[PDB]
Design a protein around this ligand. Structure first.
Ligand SMILES: O=C(O)c1cccc(-c2cccc(F)c2)c1
Ligand SMILES: [Cl-]
Length: 242
């Protein structure tokens, strides 16, 4: 069951942007979106790929645990937070592309392809460079496909160990207070048109879970804060969060 609520479009047009929000009520097994078409259009996953990438690296032993330090390679990059040592927690918090590029090289093309098929992730296509295919290669995923993947992760049903899934869900922790917990990952795709931002994850309540996946047009980095801001406005309107 899916229902289209075009009133949410106001949240995008009021900021003179365009995008889609997809919600899934786990208890009721019901979905909601403002745009059924865009909910099924496939985009580059960009840094949302750090979820599956982290899982594969952990399950193959490329990453030992969430404390292992990945030393800065000494190359000054334009993102200040990238020019320092990281572990899995901080690498995902600051979307540290260079750390995950090295993960992918050590994973290798063959094992990466095999695992993405086992995850049923997007179009499962790693065509391109092994260290950048999620940024400018052939892989694609829709918002509805993100939710399908995240639901498997939440229930520990992906084809990796329970430990790997618990560690990645820890690394996804974004916000927690007395009312809800959010585990999620942002994305920012600029190398292939259209330029978009992602935010995918879920909201934990006392007695239910709401999965979400949003993407929106991102002509400039000036609107990146809208990924979370717009999503939370939808959540408040639907009385999922206060
Ligand atoms: O949205 C983020 O969490 C994030 C984290 C790291 C770098 C960037 C970023 C911002 C502007 C340009 C760019 F290429 C990357 C965004
Ligand atoms: Cl946690």
């Amino acid at each position: 069951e899916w229902q289209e609520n075009k009133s949410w479009n106001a949240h995008f047009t009021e900021h003179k942007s365009q995008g889609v929000v997809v919600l899934w009520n786990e208890n009721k097994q019901q979905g909601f979106t403002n745009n059924l078409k865009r909910a099924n259009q496939a985009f580059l996953p960009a840094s949302t790929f750090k979820i599956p990438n982290s899982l594969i690296a952990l399950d193959l032993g490329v990453v030992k645990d969430e404390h292992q330090v990945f030393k800065w390679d000494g190359q000054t990059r334009d993102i200040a937070t990238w020019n320092r040592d990281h572990n899995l927690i901080t690498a995902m918090k600051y979307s540290v592309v260079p750390v995950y590029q090295e993960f992918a090289r050590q994973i290798g093309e063959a094992r990466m392809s095999k695992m993405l098929h086992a995850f049923d992730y997007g179009n499962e296509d790693i065509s391109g460079n092994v260290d950048s295919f999620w940024l400018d290669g052939g892989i694609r995923i829709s918002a509805t496909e993100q939710i399908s993947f995240l639901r498997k992760l939440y229930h520990n049903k992906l084809h990796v160990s329970e430990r790997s899934q618990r560690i990645v869900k820890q690394a996804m922790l974004t916000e927690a207070n007395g009312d809800y917990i959010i585990r999620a990952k942002t994305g920012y795709s600029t190398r292939i048109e259209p330029k978009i931002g992602w935010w995918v994850g879920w909201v934990e309540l006392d007695d239910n879970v709401w999965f979400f996946a949003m993407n929106m047009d991102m002509p400039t980095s000036d609107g990146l804060g809208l990924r979370q801001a717009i999503t939370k406005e939808v959540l408040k309107q639907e009385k999922i969060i206060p």
